[PDB]
Amino acid sequence: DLHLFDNSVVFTAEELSCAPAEIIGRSCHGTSYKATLDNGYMLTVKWLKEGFAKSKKEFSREIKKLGSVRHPNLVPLRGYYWGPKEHERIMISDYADATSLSTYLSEFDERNLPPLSAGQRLNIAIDIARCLDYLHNERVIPHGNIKSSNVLIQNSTPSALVTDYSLHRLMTPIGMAEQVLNAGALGYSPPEFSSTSKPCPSLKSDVYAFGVILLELLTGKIAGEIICMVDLTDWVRMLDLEERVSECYDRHIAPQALDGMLRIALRCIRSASERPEVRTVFEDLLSLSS
Template sequence: MAGVVVLASLLIGYVQGKKRKNEDDEEYELADGEDDENGGGEGKLILFQGGENLTLEDVLNATGQVMEKTSYGTVYKAKLADGGTIVLRLLRDGSCKDRNSCLPVIKQLGRVRHENLIPLRAFYQGKRGEKLLIYDYLPNRNLFDLLHETRVGKPVLNWAKRHKIALGIARGLAHLHTSLETPITHGNVRSKNVLVDDFFVARLTEFGLDKLMIPNVADEIVALSKAEGCKAPELQRMKKCNSRTDVYAFGILLLEILLGKKPGKARSGSYLDLPSLVKEAVLEETTMEVFDVEVLKGIRSPMEDGLVQALKLAMGCCAPVASVRPTMDEVVKQLEENRPRNRSALYSPTETRSEIGTPF
């Protein structure tokens, strides 16, 4: 009798688990247009959480305005007929793997939800093979502009604000690396791929897109990372990208946040290696001079406010040997343990997080 009870319990658990899996599958493939493989049609639309109200007609009739062109393709700000706004990322023609290879990656990306990551709301494949990734539109500036723009009225980025931004980026990467059933490497960590809102909440874009690209196109991202000073020394091909190469790129990004300097090749042709700049300052005992002047405003003790620890952490992330770099979970822990003292309301319960966009 006890055996029968155990078998019945196992059977019930199996059926419920299978039912949950089917429900999950339905949740993430909520609506399809007519598939071009079935002859004619306008293409296929796959919806994910937060994009349930989108229709194929909405996407096809949206009026787009070019926001930027990246190695992956062209990004458009698109107006919907109902007045809403979305972001369309049109992947480069001929740059993507075939549909059967793309769909598992797309569905995996569509399931990722974290406050420091821009969520994928839908995916469209047209009858001629064109591929669109559909995201929320967030009217925020990217971190590169916040750090390096010289316009009047730009917000002052003191250490408390920069720390919050850095911690948000680290949390987003840690989630990709360790909190998913199948880990995701970002593959293109840089300040231009970080959006920052009015509460200084950072959100990463472009994560995992290299998995959609054919190898030679994906390798273009590696070449770009080298030019921008973000490439880990051991990374030669994108297929070798892993969590440790992401950590290296984060280290360069953290140095960019602390020093306020653009890494990599400048228009003049000169090359700025941020880790070398810090090493030189340490040897010459001028470490405090490498920090951006805005970072030091209001700081009484760089050690007590976690500034020196953040610099050491960034250099640890940029270690030439991959195995000695910390994990992103360790980076998050160190940043949390060394918060700046004078952080005002930045980390209050009501302002620590802001909503991740507005579902359509």
């Protein structure tokens, strides 16, 4: 059983299974593969861990809502595969020849790549806020899985792409708990998640996680790395109170835009009640490009 949302990208279930496939990576959700169709079309084949996918009726209903979600800065979801076995729960999207933000930030020196300039960092940030603006305001659906590994950097336009959106919409409580736990471990969970036994990703949690991304863009540090002081967000928050915010900036980059980005990032990581709406954040990041 293979379902395609549009007639734009068409293939068989037997064509997908007999396609040259290579592992992209593994996560809390499951594993990602790159599949190359006969005509050159490249797809992302994301297998959800067994027990993570909701029952067929709910999953189909929820994923069709996600299938209609389209934005230039969001990677298109083309379909899904539902097989006779319990492990055969696959989400199918476009494949982008890119490098993720976390891979760029951590392994840029090892690779040929030059560090991201101050302008590129502002640009990535605007492309992400643009996408969340649309999700939050027009579709009223949270991403809920924001992390630097879900931000893709490509040479072609648009420079930044957001992937793996709204997965909590398709999962059992088991699936959702594993996602929240992993986001907590990586540092993307807001302070209100501590007060709940079973917290759910939301429009509010997205703005928090977006704040952590802005901090990774500004410092050049991955969110889950411990710092001698300890938390990335705590580091910046502790440095700010001690009048030492400038010291957080990546040594590979100070343009006023970085300070603008910092004031926005700090607003994003405040309590739910003081946390700005995503349109305000998008507009404020956008004013920095002028």
